[PDB]
Design a protein around this nucleic acid. Structure first.
Ligand code: MN
Ligand code: MN
Ligand code: MN
Ligand code: MN
Ligand code: MN
Ligand code: MN
Ligand code: MN
Ligand code: MN
Ligand code: MN
Ligand code: MN
Ligand code: MN
Ligand code: MN
Ligand code: MN
Ligand code: MN
Ligand code: MN
Ligand code: MN
Lengths: 97, 110, 85, 93, 96, 108, 79, 97
DNA sequence: ATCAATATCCACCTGCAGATTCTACCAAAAGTGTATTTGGAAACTGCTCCATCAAAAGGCATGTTCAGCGGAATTCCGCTGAACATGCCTTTTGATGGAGCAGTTTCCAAATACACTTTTGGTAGAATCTGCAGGTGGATATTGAT
DNA sequence: ATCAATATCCACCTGCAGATTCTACCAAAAGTGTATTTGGAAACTGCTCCATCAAAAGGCATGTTCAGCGGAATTCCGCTGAACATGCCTTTTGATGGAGCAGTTTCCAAATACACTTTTGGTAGAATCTGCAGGTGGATATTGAT
């Protein structure tokens, strides 16, 4: 049988996604979420199409921006695994609470 | 002859002058200001366009698309700073994989 | 029976989150990250939708436009290109 | 009948690299770019003026503006191009 | 040359509620910048609002939404309250 | 004949006419509605009293009667809403909230 | 060196107020680096306001506006 | 022969300094540097007193704020000593670049 | 658990930088009245495009196995910072000619205006050109067990 | 180092969305030429408050002693990535209804434009009341030698 040492396909993935630029969260599920979130403000709200996109491109940009920082908080603790505690610090330093 | 022409600019000096007026920035708007700005705005547009194409060029392509723009930007000390808190839709991220995440122990040639 | 659905933050699948961090260069993801990432993602959209809708309501409209999401983003320092403005 | 800088961007592009083409959305982004910076400068100009008890935003404000809102090399080249065109605008008497 | 601040006021408002409490020089300089700081904050978002809606005027509705955007939760609440009161109590544009 | 001030009308003690003056010449828009300055002034005086009260407590809590910057800081920083509204504002002479991380103390 | 004038103690103090307990040896010259790099970014902006206002002196409100456009708003000196 | 344990005067100093709000950099030194730095932008420049006051106040505020972030960085690495590598991450996760 | 050596507390009282009640003059607001002007809130409605249900279609999420290897608990040690007493040089303090910043009068170069008249850049559209995504293939790497 | 399984690369291919190319109706723009209102650069010097220096304060520089923190070395388990299979629901292509955004016209309430009248917060500043930083001495908590 063939087995790729752990962390090898992962790196295949990193190289992969940094080369492309398509959104990475499923469209509808996302739309759903937005809608849900919005409902809590104004009911019966119609969303222009692109408003979901500008919304999604936005969030994804952020989460990726945030992940890089998170990954730096990892390598810092002399590790290579992003832990819930990195995000805390990562967000804590970009200043977000 | 148009002010754009009367200045060597391809950008609408006329426009910019108006925008500035119906824009609420000052009571009055110096006559030369709109010129000076249209020039500054043209310059930048070209600067990025230059670096943008180059990215397309390097990728064997002829049509500048967002990744190119986003690449031109994140790789230019100047632009990446002027556009630090701006997000390019469909831009991607400069390819980069931290060393601590790479494989091995010295297996190069000697 | 026939008419049932659900609310959606779990709509942000573990595989997706994994992908984002992948593009962000993460190679090894500890399992507590996911619900964590979700937690964050929620309050981001929550923060942007709010301000963004405050705009629709002011326009007396009932249709969130994109320069709606956009001005909301700008307001907050996060500026977006590729949708107007 | 909304406006936009698309038309000139395209010219400016072709002038140097006539072969190069600019995608639909790439264009939309560029428009945003221009309006963005246009915005920053005008605003800074507007303040430079206000700070200094002036009712007019001259090319002098526009300049300092540029100096404040752009990085060295971009700022440098801008002030030139800026002066240039405004000097040539007065050359045309 | 004359220069005006919000000091007198800041001070009267302090004194209204808590009489045997004073305010240092810097403090007053700071509370003044705070007012101006926010004044602009608000008047500016308002400016953008109207602008955004091809409207050539700043009504109270603008100052409202602004206030709504600029200030945080419970504080945006109280502000708007205070805003709409002051105005209503102002439309008693008769005897009073 | 007789007459009060617009501030007087709105039950305000912050200058309504002034805020209206600044609003017009402040270059924000062509027109300034008649109620807008009244509304704005109301908000301002509000917040004005809001920091003031808090800043006062800060001071009194320490048996002092005169508010110094330290109080305003301590005030702003403990208030959630103010702390957020003024997060990117630094108060000249305000010091910082006392706080020593656990991993630096033995126990207590 | 004037930047050297920012004594090892001052760095130490700030770092105390900052909550730091134990300070490694390198921190000192590093902190100086940061500090200069900050002052520079601020004063460049500051002085630019000075030359525009065609003055020879650098007003307090010049620093203040500089600091403001950097997103570092300051209360206690006007503006 | 009295002597305090390594790190007991530290906290005494932490606690001592967080209670105060006195500027921590000697004024003349600072004053010089501010001037030394401005020289590179314009010569024969005069400085309002307060203009130098504004700078020190803000610069210090900034440095203090950064030291807190730095310390957090160190505690993340399960250390209690702020190293150069600390300030570095603290800044990287703040934008300063 | 027991002292010392010190640090910290706190009710107690006092001199000076600086707040306070005072009378007060006023350039400049803020207010007010009639006249002239208009930009938005309302009423009507053309058409763009947002919400849906539809039934096939498969790309993609989810669950379970398996173990490799990374993270965490733990031991030991070299050395790097904290603490400390010292006594000298650098910053702090109080006083001063005067370098420039604010204060004010000014007179046209420069910027609004309102009406026209010439020119240009967006728009629904129609004949048509074309850069590149989406696929396969054979050559050429890259991984990893052996 | 060698051999097998895989992923990646690189060249030729091509239907199709989206760019390239004129044609031309045009309404919102941009240019043009006085008539005419105005703010900015100018000339002067009244007036702070900036640079400069001497002299007693006090924080900093420094070398020594060594505790305990950090980083290396070590050991181990259980957490998460790789692989593979199952069938769920996301994605896709329309087709169709009508909710709302958006283009227009419209007229008057609400706002700008002075002239003129009343009111006020800013200020120089002598008279003077006072909060509190700062220096004292003794109760009271904390730290470390043993
Ligand atoms: Mn791949
Ligand atoms: Mn770069
Ligand atoms: Mn460059
Ligand atoms: Mn109004
Ligand atoms: Mn609160
Ligand atoms: Mn009395
Ligand atoms: Mn009207
Ligand atoms: Mn089927
Ligand atoms: Mn095992
Ligand atoms: Mn291991
Ligand atoms: Mn002179
Ligand atoms: Mn044309
Ligand atoms: Mn291809
Ligand atoms: Mn240890
Ligand atoms: Mn009075
Ligand atoms: Mn005391």
């Amino acid at each position: 049988p063939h087995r790729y040492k752990p962390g090898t396909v992962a790196l295949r993935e990193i190289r992969r996604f940094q080369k492309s630029t398509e959104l990475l969260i499923r469209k509808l599920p996302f739309q759903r979420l937005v809608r849900e979130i919005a409902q809590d403000f104004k009911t019966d709200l119609r969303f222009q199409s692109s408003a979901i996109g500008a919304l999604q491109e936005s969030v994804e940009a952020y989460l990726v921006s945030l992940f890089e920082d998170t990954n730096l908080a990892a390598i810092h603790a002399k590790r290579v695994t992003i832990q819930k505690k990195e995000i805390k610090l990562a967000r804590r330093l970009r200043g977000e609470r | 002859q148009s002010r754009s022409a009367k200045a060597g600019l391809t950008f609408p000096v006329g426009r910019v002058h108006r925008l500035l007026r119906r824009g609420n920035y000052a009571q009055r708007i110096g006559s030369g200001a709109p010129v000076y700005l249209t020039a500054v705005l043209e310059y930048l547009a070209a600067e990025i366009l230059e670096l943008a194409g180059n990215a397309a060029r390097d990728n064997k392509k002829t049509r500048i698309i967002p990744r190119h723009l986003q690449l031109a930007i994140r790789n230019d000390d100047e632009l990446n700073k002027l556009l630090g808190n701006v997000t390019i839709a469909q831009g991607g991220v400069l390819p980069n994989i931290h060393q601590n995440l790479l494989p091995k122990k010295s297996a190069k040639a000697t | 029976h026939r008419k049932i659905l659900r609310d959606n933050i779990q709509g942000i699948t573990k595989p997706a989150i994994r992908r984002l961090a992948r593009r962000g260069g993460v190679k090894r993801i500890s399992g507590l990250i996911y619900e964590e990432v979700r937690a964050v993602l929620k309050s981001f959209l929550e923060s942007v939708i709010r301000d963004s809708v405050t705009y629709t309501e002011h326009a007396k409209r009932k249709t969130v436009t994109s320069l709606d999401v956009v001005y909301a983003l700008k307001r907050q320092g996060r500026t977006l290109y590729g949708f107007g403005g | 009948r909304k406006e936009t800088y698309s038309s000139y961007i395209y010219k400016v592009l072709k002038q140097t690299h006539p072969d190069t083409g600019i995608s639909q959305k790439s264009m939309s982004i560029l428009n945003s770019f221009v309006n963005d910076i246009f915005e920053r400068i005008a605003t800074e100009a507007s303040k430079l003026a206000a700070y200094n008890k002036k009712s007019t935003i001259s090319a002098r404000e526009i300049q300092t503006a540029v100096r404040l809102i752009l990085p060295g090399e971009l700022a440098k080249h801008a002030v030139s191009e800026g002066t240039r065109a405004v000097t040539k605008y007065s050359s045309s008497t």
